[model samples]
Target: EVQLVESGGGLVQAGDSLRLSCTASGRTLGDYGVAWFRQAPGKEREFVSVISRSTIITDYADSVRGRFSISADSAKNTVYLQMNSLKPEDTAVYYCAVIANPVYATSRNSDDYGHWGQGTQVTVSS
Candidate 1:
């Protein structure tokens, strides 16, 4: 069993940088991968990136491959998303989630947990 919480998002200027954090409880963050997602003000949700447990591997969505990055501090049970050169297009609700790594399990439930944060709403202004 596990639950997570993320820091609140805030307003930022174009070309600026921002960092959001998600902390885990009920489970050690080092034991599973963390996922980051986003949804524009009126658009559907989209995958931003995923940082594997222990920060071994990271897969990012092409849309943000250049301006986004991720890191984690397992000692603190937290993960961080670094958003650089933010622009209006970056305005959205960013969410952090968890993925269990019980690989090769007979059932999909081992890899199907979708625990998401309430989401941090970020705004980019001129």
Candidate 2:
């Protein structure tokens, strides 16, 4: 089965920045789709960004358009999520996920996200 391993956890300041990493097992990061997501306590998960080899596309959402970025390291079979502005609202468990394809537009029955990592929790205390 496919799985991801997220590295690094943080106790960050409200204004500080943080970065998390993810490595995959059973698949190659140079191929397929990789994504980053965050889930706040008792709240819905938010999509951060995505990197797709098939589409050769990298997409970001307004939820993190200005302050967050996602990148892939094919040489290491890993991806990363970097947050420039860590706010109280941003305190959550950041998960590394895998998608069938990272395209923004999806077809019916497309498995967008299926595999996940243990996630890294970052607490923002001011």
Candidate 3:
């Protein structure tokens, strides 16, 4: 059962957008939704957005202006997640996850998260 893994961390400047990828090799995503989250410094995780199968639907909380989107290239068996605005506050650990049907968990403690990338950390700097 191959899984997805992201590259290491990166540092960007203000007003710059960055692109990172999650490569899902021998694994199959099927109809699950691809989601992303942000773990800010000493703060709880915040939902960035989700791409259904291969489409970007809901986005970062408050839309956060032009700072987020999810995309994929099934032909390459990879999913590309990007972030914009490049604010210092945007720095954190971004993760890619494949979620099973929310209905699968009668409670919120089951294995609702079917898969997750190791996570990619990004920081906004000068």
Question: Best lDDT goes to which candidate?
Answer: 1
lDDT of 2 at 126: 85
Instruction: Give me the overall lDDT of model 3.
Output: 0.67
Better of 1 and 3 by TM-score: 1
TM-score of each: 0.86, 0.85, 0.78
lDDT per residue for candidate 1 within 30-81, as digits (tens), equals 7787888888977766778787765878878877889989889877888999
lDDT against the true structure, per candidate, is 0.79, 0.76, 0.67
Clashes per candidate, residues 3 or more apart or on different chains: 0, 0, 0
The TM-score of predicted model 1 comes to: 0.86
Clashing residue pairs for model 3: none
Tell me the lDDT of candidate 2: 0.76
lDDT (10s digit) by residue, model 3, range 91-116: 88977676667443121221455567
Off by over 4 Å in 2: 101-111
Candidate 3 residues lying further than 4 Å off, grouped into runs, are 54-58, 63-65, 102-112
> For candidate 2, lDDT tens digit of each residue in 1-126?
677998876898988988789888887776667777778899867787777755367777676788888788777778887888878888889887777654543222224776778889989998
Lowest-scoring 10 consecutive residues by lDDT in candidate 2? 102-111
Answer with 1 or 2, whichever has the higher TM-score: 1
RMSD of 2: 3.0
